[PDB]
Design a protein around this ligand. Structure first.
Ligand SMILES: [Mg+2]
Ligand SMILES: [Mg+2]
Ligand SMILES: [Zn+2]
Lengths: 98, 140, 67, 192, 215
């Protein structure tokens, strides 16, 4: 029978959508389908920043360390296994942004 | 006494600048220091020069040693401040910094070193070219 | 045998780790010559209360997790 | 008046300089100052009672530990008394101020936790606790005594005596105890 | 003890030092130092460093320079005055902090490429970065759309580039560079643009010296 309405993807008008490589397996996945979560990563762990702030050098505009920018793109296959998105129950499958 | 080579100019209020390039792969880590023009290499310490097992050629430990190893060499170049250009085989590879990344920096700061500006220079492409593996990629 | 044994005491007992379900994670405060005051989150093994004192043979550490 | 140990060993003859061991040892208490190391106490009941145990009672306990041969404190209190006389006749020091030091030295400060993932046996850096540290120290000390003590005319009160001494010295060539104390840290310093 | 090393003949022996300096509107100071290998008859001391290139963050003016420390200026050693490295303009840019910085997923992104002509006998390429601005208090959500009909987009390109080709035809590289780094053009573009569609975070992403005559 049928499991989803969007079958995991958002292709709603067009017949074909660009394919993209998986951040983790390298596998090819259609853009719309594949998981995404472009995150604002930080250069150093918590208590570890303070250590670099005191031994820091250049001016101090209070702008600290540049934060890392990671544009994340997972294919289902590994996205799951990678703790990202856990198999959700029946009616919770339609919930968006919990 | 010692015959340093840093330009003829001291001063506990005169900062010296050295551009430290750091590439952090999931296999190996690099730490480089060079003129702010980057055309004359000074210090070059990689995790490989720091351990025996090829798997550890990355490590947080290898980053400490390769890091502290450079700082010593640097006080001798008479340089105290370092600009950081951080990367990670951007190309068509996990544009994410390795592990021996936050480890290397941390070591430079602790072992004294002053830190100039900090950039991220992982080469992000506009297009792309058929990645590692193909169609399905590393499976297992 | 010339070691840098910086004595540090337990600030807060975080949680338990290592599915070996026996290791303990703890937040420390130092008291030694080198630095002092610096706080670290180290991993113990064995009986430990709040406020004990532990000889760290490597202040450059502090692994961590809480999930 | 002050109740000396075995009738001839002032307790106040020692002090715990390091803060670590201060609460994880017995010399320090008024209640601890005992003539005999036998208290048939009720330690090992709450989850830290062991502390309040007069350090030597602990030694005696850990000492009567080999199966068939052991299980009788009566005797063990002896093997420990003679051993104290013998330690004294060599360094003429308050043998508690010896055994005590040994306890502080023979305890590894670092160990490795075996954390294996799918066949591979990995390890990490772990800092050894105080209670655990003392426990290991004594367990270790005694552990060794039996080592040589076996088919030897050398007696436990002698083996043990000879041990508690070097164990205080850190003599890495004369203390099966401190050997591990070092190795455990070394190997551990490798896995870390 | 038995060491594992011992210093015998440093490699950085035959090394001469120099100072980074570029007039234009940047401080007289000698920010940072370079390094080179002594002369050797064939090798000419201060003469290999000709096509040298330095990337510098704005700390090339003492004032409000520490603030605007994201414009990566690239300079070429153009001449050397004994122990000093003189430099002219080569390139102008930005960094990941800023670039990835202004990038939200509910607005539009515009880019304008331009080939300018300066009376100095200099050819440039200037990249512009434009972003659409909201105007309704609604913090850009999945519900807020700040897109700008592709017709309006190019409408701006056409306008932006056209403004800059005229701006260059009337300036000296010394003036242009000075202006490019300054919020002068941010305001001007903002003026022509609010006519087509109100923008935000406007920037001159990058500038490349295409062909610089050496009259
Ligand atoms: Mg189709
Ligand atoms: Mg709208
Ligand atoms: Zn995958």
């Amino acid at each position: 029978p049928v499991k989803r309405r969007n079958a995991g993807r958002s292709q709603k008008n067009r017949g074909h959508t660009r394919t993209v490589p998986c951040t983790n397996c390298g596998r090819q996945v259609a853009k719309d389908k594949a998981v995404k979560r472009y995150t604002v990563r930080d250069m150093v762990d918590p208590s570890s920043k303070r250590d670099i702030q005191q031994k820091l050098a250049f001016e101090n505009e209070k702008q600290g360390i540049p934060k890392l920018y990671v544009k994340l793109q997972y294919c289902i296959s590994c996205a799951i296994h990678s703790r990202v998105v856990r198999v959700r129950c029946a009616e919770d499958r339609r919930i968006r942004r919990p | 006494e010692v015959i340093s080579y840093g330009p003829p100019n001291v001063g506990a209020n005169e900062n010296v600048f050295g551009v430290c390039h750091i590439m952090a792969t999931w296999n190996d880590t690099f730490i480089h220091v060079t003129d702010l023009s980057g055309r004359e290499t000074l210090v070059r310490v990689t995790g490989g020069m720091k351990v025996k097992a090829d798997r550890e050629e990355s490590s947080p430990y290898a980053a400490m040693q390769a890091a502290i190893d450079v700082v010593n060499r640097c006080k001798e170049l008479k340089i105290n401040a370092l600009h950081i250009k951080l990367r990670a085989k951007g190309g068509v590879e996990t544009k994410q910094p390795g592990p021996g990344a936050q480890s290397a920096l941390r070591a430079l700061a602790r072992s004294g070193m002053k830190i100039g500006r900090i950039e991220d220079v992982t080469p992000i492409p506009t297009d792309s070219t058929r990645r590692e593996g193909g169609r399905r990629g590393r499976r297992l | 045998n010339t070691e840098e044994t910086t004595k540090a005491r337990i600030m807060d007992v975080l949680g338990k780790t290592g599915s070996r379900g026996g290791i303990t994670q703890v937040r420390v405060v130092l008291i030694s010559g080198k630095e002092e005051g610096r706080q670290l989150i180290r991993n113990v093994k064995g009986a430990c209360r709040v406020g004990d004192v532990l000889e760290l043979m490597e202040c450059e550490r502090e692994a961590r997790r809480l999930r | 008046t002050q109740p000396k140990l075995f009738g001839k060993w002032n307790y106040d003859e020692v002090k715990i300089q390091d803060p670590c061991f201060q609460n994880y040892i017995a010399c320090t208490t008024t209640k601890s100052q005992v003539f005999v190391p036998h208290t048939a106490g009720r330690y090992q009941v709450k989850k830290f009672r062991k502390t309040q145990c007069p350090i030597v009672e602990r030694l005696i306990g850990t000492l009567m530990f080999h199966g068939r041969n052991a299980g009788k404190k009566a005797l063990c209190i002896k093997v420990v008394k003679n051993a104290f006389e013998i330690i004294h006749l060599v360094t003429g020091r308050n043998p508690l101020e010896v055994f005590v030091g040994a306890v502080q030295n023979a305890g590894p400060r670092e160990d490795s936790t075996r954390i294996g993932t799918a066949g591979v046996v990995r390890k990490q850096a772990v800092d050894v606790a105080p209670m655990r540290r003392v426990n290991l120290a004594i367990y270790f000390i005694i552990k060794g005594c039996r080592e040589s003590a076996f088919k030897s005319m050398r007696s436990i009160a002698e083996t043990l005596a000879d041990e508690i001494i070097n164990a205080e010295k850190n003599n890495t060539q004369s203390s099966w105890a401190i050997r591990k104390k070092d190795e455990i840290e070394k190997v551990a310093k490798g896995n870390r | 003890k038995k060491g594992a090393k011992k210093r015998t003949i440093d490699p950085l022996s035959r090394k001469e030092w120099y100072d980074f300096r570029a007039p234009i509107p940047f401080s007289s100071k000698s920010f940072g130092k370079t390094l080179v290998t002594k002369s050797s008859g064939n090798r000419i001391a201060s003469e290999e460093i000709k096509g040298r290139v330095v990337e510098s963050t704005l700390a090339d003016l003492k004032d409000n320079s520490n603030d605007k420390a994201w414009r990566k200026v690239k300079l070429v050693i153009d001449e050397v005055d004994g122990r000093n490295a003189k430099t002219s303009f080569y390139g102008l840019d930005i960094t990941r902090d800023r670039l990835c910085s202004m990038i939200r997923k509910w607005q539009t992104l515009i880019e304008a490429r331009v080939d300018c002509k300066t009376n100095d006998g200099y050819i440039i390429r200037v990249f512009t970065l434009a972003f659409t601005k909201k105007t309704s208090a609604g913090k850009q959500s999945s519900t807020s759309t700040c897109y700008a009909k592709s017709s309006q987009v190019r409408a701006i390109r056409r306008k932006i580039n056209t403004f800059i080709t005229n701006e260059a035809a009337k300036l000296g590289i010394a003036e242009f560079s000075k202006n490019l780094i300054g919020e002068d053009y941010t305001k001007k573009i903002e003026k022509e643009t609010k006519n087509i569609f109100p923008l935000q975070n406007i920037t001159i992403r990058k500038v490349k010296v295409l062909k610089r005559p050496k009259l």
